Amino acid sequence: GACLGFGKSCNPSNDQCCKSSSLACSTKHKWCKYEL
Q: How many structural domains is the chain composed of?
């Protein structure tokens, strides 16, 4: 269990968020945003 939950500061070039919670790092907001 090693990732970045929602509302965490992540990197766009290296998106590293929690996939389990359907998260992703966007180069627009630069943060783990819920993948709709």
A: 1
